[PDB]
Amino acid sequence: KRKIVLLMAYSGKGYHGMQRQFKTIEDDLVSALVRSGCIPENHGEDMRKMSFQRCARTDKGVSAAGQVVSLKVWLIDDILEKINSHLPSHIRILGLKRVTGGFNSKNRCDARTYCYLLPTFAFAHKDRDVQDETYRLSAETLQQVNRLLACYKGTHNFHNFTSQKGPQDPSACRYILEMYCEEPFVREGLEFAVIRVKGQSFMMHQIRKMVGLVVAIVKGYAPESVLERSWGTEKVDVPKAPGLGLVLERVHFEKYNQRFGNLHEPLDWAQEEGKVAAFKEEHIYPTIIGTERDERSMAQWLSTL
Ligand SMILES: NCCCC[C@@H](N)C(=O)O
């Protein structure tokens, strides 16, 4: 009866992505919507009768601190609580807002910010450094990482950073506003670092390949010259990092609020930022960290380089 937008978050492990194998995030969401009585059962079976859309089709294993979806529901009392009561702890609806009927979240959002949490031995040189959990990131290596990541900034032909895309395809070009790596931190004897990237839009496997290539370079499996060569017309076999560390941090609506905001209303989750950071630190990060500690996801992939 009313078109709403939802701010939600989830740990991606144990799912096969957001949309569409294991269950998906939307499977849990739909079930929670049906059980709570926000939508009738047929709206859950056919996700078009409630006009359901999602901003980011996060891949298998990928987490999200600020996923955004839009749909029509029965605005039942305490709707946020009710929906959450049918969800596991690792999926939370953080915010809800009533929007105009014509609002399409996927078609209206601009830039996305992702982070990538990884063990620091992903930057350990294969010839000079230890290759296990005992490795500690040096200041010089971090400088190298940030120097390389900075080269991604601006507009480039990113055809080598996805699949089945030609160099002459205009849609292969993408815009990177920012990319860097934060200072490392230790948790339970393991050192991690957070890579953050902001882009106007991303192609399939793009961030994982951007990270993978820099990892290959820093570790010494590829010369630095391959980076600048990668945005040329030539094809480059770019390594694809695991999806475990990848987290969707924010879906931006700044350009939407400017261009459309003045049949449309401004969308802003600034008030829910506390819950966003809380869920990331309490449910997203610890699962990634624990998984790396016990299953050695990154280490296994690094072996294949
Ligand atoms: N929408 C294309 C993919 C973007 C990256 C991230 N959302 C993922 O699927 O892993």
Numbering used by the authors: 83 to 102, 108 to 349, 352 to 394
From the primary publication:
One of the first identified was the pseudouridine synthase 1 (hPus1p), which is a member of the TruA family despite their low sequence similarity (<20%;). We have characterised the catalytic domain of the hPus1p protein biochemically and structurally. The atomic model shows the typical fold for a pseudouridine synthase from the TruA family.
Crystals of ΔhPus1p belong to space group P212121, with two molecules per asymmetric unit. In molecule A, the carboxyl group of the lysine molecule forms a hydrogen bond with the backbone atoms of residue D146, while the lysine amide group is bound to the hydroxyl group of residue Y201. In molecule B of the same crystal form, the backbone of the glutamate compound is hydrogen bonded to the hydroxyl group of residue Y201, while the main chain and the side chain of residue R295 stabilise the OE1 and OE2 positions of the glutamate. The carboxyl groups of the two amino acids are located near the backbone of residue D146 and occupy roughly the same position in both molecules of ΔhPus1p. However, the glutamate and the lysine side chains are orientated in opposite directions. The side chain of the glutamate points towards residue R295 of α5, while the lysine NZ atom faces residue R144 of the catalytic loop.
